Coordinates of N, CA, C and O in Angstrom, one line a residue:
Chain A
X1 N 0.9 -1.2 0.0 CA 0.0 0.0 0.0 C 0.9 1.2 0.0 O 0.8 2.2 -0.7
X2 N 1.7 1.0 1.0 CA 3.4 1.9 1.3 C 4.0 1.9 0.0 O 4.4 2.8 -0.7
X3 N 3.9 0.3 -0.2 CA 5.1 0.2 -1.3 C 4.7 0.5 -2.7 O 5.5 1.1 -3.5
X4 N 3.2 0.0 -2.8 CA 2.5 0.7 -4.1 C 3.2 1.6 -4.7 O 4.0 1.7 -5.6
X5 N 2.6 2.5 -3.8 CA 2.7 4.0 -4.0 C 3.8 4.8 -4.1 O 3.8 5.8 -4.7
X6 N 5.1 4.4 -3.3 CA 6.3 4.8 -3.5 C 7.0 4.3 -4.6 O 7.8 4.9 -5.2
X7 N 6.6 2.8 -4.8 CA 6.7 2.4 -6.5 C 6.1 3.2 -7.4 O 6.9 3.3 -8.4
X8 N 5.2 3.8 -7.6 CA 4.4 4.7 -8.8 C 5.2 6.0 -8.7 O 5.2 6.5 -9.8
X9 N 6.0 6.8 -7.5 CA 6.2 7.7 -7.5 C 7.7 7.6 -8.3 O 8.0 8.5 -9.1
X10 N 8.4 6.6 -8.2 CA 10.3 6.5 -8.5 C 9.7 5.9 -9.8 O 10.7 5.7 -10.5
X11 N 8.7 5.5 -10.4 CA 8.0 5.2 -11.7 C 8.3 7.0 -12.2 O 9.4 7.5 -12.4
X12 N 7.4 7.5 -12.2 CA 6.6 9.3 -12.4 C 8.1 9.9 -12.5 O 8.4 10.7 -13.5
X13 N 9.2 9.5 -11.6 CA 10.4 10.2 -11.3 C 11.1 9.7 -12.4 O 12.2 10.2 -12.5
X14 N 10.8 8.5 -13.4 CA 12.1 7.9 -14.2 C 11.7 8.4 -15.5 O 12.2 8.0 -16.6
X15 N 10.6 9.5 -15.5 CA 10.4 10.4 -17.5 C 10.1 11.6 -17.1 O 9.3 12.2 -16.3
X16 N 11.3 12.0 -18.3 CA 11.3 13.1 -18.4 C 10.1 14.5 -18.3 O 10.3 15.7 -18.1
X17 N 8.9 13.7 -18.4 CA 7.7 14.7 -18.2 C 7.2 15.1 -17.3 O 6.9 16.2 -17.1
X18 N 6.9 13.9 -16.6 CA 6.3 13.6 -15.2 C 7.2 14.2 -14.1 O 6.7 14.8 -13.2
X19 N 8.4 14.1 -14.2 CA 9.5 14.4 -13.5 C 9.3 16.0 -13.4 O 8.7 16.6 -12.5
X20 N 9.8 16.4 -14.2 CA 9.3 18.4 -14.6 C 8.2 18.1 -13.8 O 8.5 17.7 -12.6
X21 N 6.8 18.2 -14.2 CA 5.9 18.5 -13.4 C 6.2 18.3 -11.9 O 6.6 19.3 -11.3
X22 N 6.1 17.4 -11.4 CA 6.8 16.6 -9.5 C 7.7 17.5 -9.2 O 8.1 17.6 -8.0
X23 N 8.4 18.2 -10.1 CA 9.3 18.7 -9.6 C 9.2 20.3 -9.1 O 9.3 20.9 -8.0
X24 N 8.8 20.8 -10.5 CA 8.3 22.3 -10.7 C 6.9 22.6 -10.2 O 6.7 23.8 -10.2
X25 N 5.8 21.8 -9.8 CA 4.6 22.4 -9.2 C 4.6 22.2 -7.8 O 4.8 21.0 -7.5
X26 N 4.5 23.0 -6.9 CA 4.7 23.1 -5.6 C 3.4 22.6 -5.6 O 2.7 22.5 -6.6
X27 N 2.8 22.2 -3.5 CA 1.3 22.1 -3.4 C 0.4 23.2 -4.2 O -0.5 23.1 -5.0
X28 N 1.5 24.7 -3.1 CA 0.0 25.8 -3.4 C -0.4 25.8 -5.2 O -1.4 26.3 -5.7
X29 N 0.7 25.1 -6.0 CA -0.1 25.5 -7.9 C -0.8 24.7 -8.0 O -1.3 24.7 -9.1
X30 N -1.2 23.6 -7.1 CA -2.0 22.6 -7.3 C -3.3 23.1 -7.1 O -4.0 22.4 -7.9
X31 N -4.0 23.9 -6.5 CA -5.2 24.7 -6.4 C -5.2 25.7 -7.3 O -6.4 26.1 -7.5
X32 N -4.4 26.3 -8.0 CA -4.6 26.8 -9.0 C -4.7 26.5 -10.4 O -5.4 27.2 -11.1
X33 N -4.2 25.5 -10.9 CA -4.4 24.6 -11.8 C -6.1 23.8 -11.5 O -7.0 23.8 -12.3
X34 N -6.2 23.3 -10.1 CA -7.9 22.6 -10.3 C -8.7 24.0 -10.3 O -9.9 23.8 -10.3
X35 N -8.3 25.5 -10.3 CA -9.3 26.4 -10.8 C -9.6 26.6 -12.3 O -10.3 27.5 -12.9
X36 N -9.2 26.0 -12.6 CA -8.8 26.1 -14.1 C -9.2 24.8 -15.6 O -9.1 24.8 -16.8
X37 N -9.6 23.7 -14.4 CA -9.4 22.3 -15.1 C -10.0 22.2 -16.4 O -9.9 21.2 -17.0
Chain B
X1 N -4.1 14.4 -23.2 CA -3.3 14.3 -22.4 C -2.8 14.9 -21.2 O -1.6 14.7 -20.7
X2 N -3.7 15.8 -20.7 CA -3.2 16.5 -19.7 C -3.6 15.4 -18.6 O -4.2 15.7 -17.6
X3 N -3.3 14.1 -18.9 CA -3.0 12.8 -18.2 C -1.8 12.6 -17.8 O -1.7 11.5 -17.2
X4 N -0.8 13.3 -17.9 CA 0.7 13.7 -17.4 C 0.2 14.1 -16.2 O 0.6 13.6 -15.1
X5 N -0.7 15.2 -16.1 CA -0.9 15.6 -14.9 C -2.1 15.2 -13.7 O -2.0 15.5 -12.5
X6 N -3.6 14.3 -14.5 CA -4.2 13.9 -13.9 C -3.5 12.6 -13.0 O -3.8 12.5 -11.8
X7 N -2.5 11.6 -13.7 CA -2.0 10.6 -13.2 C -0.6 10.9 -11.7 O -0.2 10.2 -10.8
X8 N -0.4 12.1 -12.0 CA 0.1 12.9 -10.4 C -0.8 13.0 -9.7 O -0.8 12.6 -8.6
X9 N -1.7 13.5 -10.3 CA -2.7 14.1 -9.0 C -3.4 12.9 -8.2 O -3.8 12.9 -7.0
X10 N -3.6 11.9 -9.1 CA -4.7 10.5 -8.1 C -3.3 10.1 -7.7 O -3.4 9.7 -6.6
X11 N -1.6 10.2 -8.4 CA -0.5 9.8 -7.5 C -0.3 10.1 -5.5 O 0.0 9.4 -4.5
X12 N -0.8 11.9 -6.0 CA -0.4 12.8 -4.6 C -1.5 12.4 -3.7 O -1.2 12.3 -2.5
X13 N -2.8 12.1 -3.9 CA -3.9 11.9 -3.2 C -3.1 11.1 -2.3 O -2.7 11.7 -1.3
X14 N -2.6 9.8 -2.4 CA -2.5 8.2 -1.8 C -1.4 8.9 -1.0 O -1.0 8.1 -0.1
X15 N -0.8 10.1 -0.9 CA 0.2 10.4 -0.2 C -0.5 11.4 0.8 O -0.3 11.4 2.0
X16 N -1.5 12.4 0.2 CA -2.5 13.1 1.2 C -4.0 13.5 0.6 O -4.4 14.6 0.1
X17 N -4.5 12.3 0.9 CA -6.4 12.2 1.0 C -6.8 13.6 1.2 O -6.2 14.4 1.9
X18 N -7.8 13.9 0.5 CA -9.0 14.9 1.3 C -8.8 14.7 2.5 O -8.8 15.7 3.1
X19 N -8.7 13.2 3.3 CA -9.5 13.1 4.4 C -8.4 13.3 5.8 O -8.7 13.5 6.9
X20 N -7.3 13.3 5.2 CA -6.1 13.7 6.3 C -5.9 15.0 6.9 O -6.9 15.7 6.9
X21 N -5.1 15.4 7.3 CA -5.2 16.3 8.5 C -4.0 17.1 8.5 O -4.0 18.3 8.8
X22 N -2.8 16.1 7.9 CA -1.6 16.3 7.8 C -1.8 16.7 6.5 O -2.2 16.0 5.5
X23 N -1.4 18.2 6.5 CA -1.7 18.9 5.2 C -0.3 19.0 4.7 O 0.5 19.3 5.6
X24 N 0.3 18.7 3.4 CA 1.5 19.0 2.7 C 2.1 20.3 2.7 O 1.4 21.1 2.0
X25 N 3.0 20.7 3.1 CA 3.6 22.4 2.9 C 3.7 23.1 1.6 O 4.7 22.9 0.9
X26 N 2.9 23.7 1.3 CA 1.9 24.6 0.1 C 3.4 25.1 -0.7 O 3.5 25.1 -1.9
X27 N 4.6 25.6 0.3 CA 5.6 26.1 -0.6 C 5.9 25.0 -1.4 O 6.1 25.4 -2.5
X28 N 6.2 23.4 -1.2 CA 6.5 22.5 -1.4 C 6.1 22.0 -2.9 O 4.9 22.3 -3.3
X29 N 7.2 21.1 -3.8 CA 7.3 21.0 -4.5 C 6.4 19.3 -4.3 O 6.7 18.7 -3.2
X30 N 5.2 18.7 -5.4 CA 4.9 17.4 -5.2 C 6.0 16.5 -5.0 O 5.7 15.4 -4.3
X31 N 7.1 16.7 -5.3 CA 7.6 15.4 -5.1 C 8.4 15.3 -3.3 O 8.5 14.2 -2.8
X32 N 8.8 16.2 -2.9 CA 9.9 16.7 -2.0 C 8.4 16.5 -1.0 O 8.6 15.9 0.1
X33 N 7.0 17.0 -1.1 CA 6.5 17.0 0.1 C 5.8 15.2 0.2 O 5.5 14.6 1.3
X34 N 5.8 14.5 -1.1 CA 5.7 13.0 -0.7 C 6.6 12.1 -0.6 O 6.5 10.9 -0.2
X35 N 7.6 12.6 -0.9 CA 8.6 11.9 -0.1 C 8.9 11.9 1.3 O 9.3 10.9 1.9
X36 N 8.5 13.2 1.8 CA 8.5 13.2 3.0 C 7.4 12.9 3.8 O 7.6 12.6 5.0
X37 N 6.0 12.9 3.3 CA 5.4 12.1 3.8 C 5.6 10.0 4.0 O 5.3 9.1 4.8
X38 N 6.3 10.3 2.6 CA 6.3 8.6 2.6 C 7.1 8.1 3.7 O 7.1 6.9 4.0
X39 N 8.0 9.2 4.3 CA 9.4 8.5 5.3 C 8.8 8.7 6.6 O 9.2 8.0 7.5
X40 N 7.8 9.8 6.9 CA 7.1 9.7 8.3 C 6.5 8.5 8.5 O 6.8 7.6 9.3
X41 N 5.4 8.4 7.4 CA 5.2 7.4 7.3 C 5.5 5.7 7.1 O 4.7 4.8 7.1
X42 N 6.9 5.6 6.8 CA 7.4 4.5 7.2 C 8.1 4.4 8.3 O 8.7 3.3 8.3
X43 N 8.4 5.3 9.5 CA 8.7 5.2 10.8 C 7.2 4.8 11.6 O 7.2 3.8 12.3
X44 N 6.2 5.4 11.6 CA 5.1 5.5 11.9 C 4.9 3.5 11.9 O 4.9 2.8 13.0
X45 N 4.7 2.9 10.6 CA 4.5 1.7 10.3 C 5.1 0.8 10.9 O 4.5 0.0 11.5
X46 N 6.3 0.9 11.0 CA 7.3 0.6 11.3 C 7.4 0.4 13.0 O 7.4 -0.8 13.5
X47 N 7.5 1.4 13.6 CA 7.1 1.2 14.8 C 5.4 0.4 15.3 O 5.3 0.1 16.5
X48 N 4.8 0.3 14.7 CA 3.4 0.1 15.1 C 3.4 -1.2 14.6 O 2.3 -1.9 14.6
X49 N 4.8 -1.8 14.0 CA 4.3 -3.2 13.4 C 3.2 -3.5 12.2 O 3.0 -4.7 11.8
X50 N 2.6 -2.5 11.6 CA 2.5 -2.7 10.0 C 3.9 -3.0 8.8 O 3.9 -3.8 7.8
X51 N 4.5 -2.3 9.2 CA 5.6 -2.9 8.2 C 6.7 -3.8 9.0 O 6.7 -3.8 10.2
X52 N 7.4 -4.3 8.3 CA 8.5 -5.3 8.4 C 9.9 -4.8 8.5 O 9.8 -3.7 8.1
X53 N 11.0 -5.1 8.8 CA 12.2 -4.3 8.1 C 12.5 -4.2 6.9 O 12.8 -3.1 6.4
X54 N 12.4 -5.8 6.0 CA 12.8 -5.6 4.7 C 11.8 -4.4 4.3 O 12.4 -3.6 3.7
X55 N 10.9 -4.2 4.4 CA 9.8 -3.2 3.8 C 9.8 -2.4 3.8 O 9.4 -1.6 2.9
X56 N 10.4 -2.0 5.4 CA 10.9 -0.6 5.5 C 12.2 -0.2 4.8 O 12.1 0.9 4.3
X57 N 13.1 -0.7 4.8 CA 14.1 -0.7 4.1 C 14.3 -0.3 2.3 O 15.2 0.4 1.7
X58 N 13.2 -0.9 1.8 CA 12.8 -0.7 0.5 C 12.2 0.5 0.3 O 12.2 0.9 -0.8
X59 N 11.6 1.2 1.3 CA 10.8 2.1 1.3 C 11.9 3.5 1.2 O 11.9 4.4 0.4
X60 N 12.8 3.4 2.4 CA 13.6 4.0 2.6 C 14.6 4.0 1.4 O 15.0 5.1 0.9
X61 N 15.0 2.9 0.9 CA 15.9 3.4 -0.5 C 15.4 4.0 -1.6 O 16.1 4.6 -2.5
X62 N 14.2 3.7 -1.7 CA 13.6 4.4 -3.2 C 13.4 5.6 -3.0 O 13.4 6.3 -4.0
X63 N 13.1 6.2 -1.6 CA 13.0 7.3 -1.4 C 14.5 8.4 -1.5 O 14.3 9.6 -1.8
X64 N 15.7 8.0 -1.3 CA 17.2 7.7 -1.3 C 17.4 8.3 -2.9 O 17.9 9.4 -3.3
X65 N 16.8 7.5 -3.7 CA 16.6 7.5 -5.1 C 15.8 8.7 -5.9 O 16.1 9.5 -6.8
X66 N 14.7 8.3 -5.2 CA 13.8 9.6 -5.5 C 14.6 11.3 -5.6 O 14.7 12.1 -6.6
X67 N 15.2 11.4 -3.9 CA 16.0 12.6 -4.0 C 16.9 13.2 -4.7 O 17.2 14.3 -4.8
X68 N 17.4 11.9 -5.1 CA 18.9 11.8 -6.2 C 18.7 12.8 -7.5 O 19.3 13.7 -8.0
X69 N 17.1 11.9 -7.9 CA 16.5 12.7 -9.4 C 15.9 14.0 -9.1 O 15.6 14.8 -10.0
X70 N 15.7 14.3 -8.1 CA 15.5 15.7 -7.6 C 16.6 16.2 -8.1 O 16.8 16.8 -9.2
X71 N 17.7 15.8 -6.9 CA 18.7 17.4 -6.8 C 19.6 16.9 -7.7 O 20.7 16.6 -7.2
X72 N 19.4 16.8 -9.1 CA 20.2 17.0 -10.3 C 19.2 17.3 -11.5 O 18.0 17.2 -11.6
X73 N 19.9 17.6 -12.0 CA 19.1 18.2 -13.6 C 17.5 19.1 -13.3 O 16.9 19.6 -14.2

């Protein structure tokens, strides 16, 4: 459940796309982005 | 495609629910504030006897890893 999910994240962290995003959007842009969806 | 970013978002949930309490630090970047939730939470487990050592241990190095791809490039 632990492991799941820390598997999906070092998944997200190994391309190039997903990685930028995880990296570059802090929490607070996460509420501004779902204003927007 | 903006499934690049829906597939983060149901990611960050499993790290902090609506229903939690323990709110993520808003300056915080997604990955840096679930990482650190993931390592409270594997002391937490850990002590309480939900996880194992090997488990914890695995938990703790991918997280090891995770940071790596952070602080470069």
């Amino acid at each position: 459940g632990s492991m799941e999910r820390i598997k999906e994240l070092r998944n997200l962290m190994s391309q190039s796309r997903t990685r930028e995003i995880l990296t570059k959007t802090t929490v607070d842009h996460m509420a501004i982005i779902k204003k927007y969806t | 495609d903006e499934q690049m970013y829906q597939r983060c978002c149901n990611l960050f949930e499993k790290f902090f629910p609506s229903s939690s309490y323990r709110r993520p630090v808003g300056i915080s970047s997604m990955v840096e504030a679930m990482v650190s939730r993931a390592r409270i939470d594997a002391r937490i487990d850990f002590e309480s006897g939900r996880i194992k050592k090997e488990e914890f241990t695995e938990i703790m190095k991918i997280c090891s890893t995770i940071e790596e791809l952070r602080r470069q490039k």
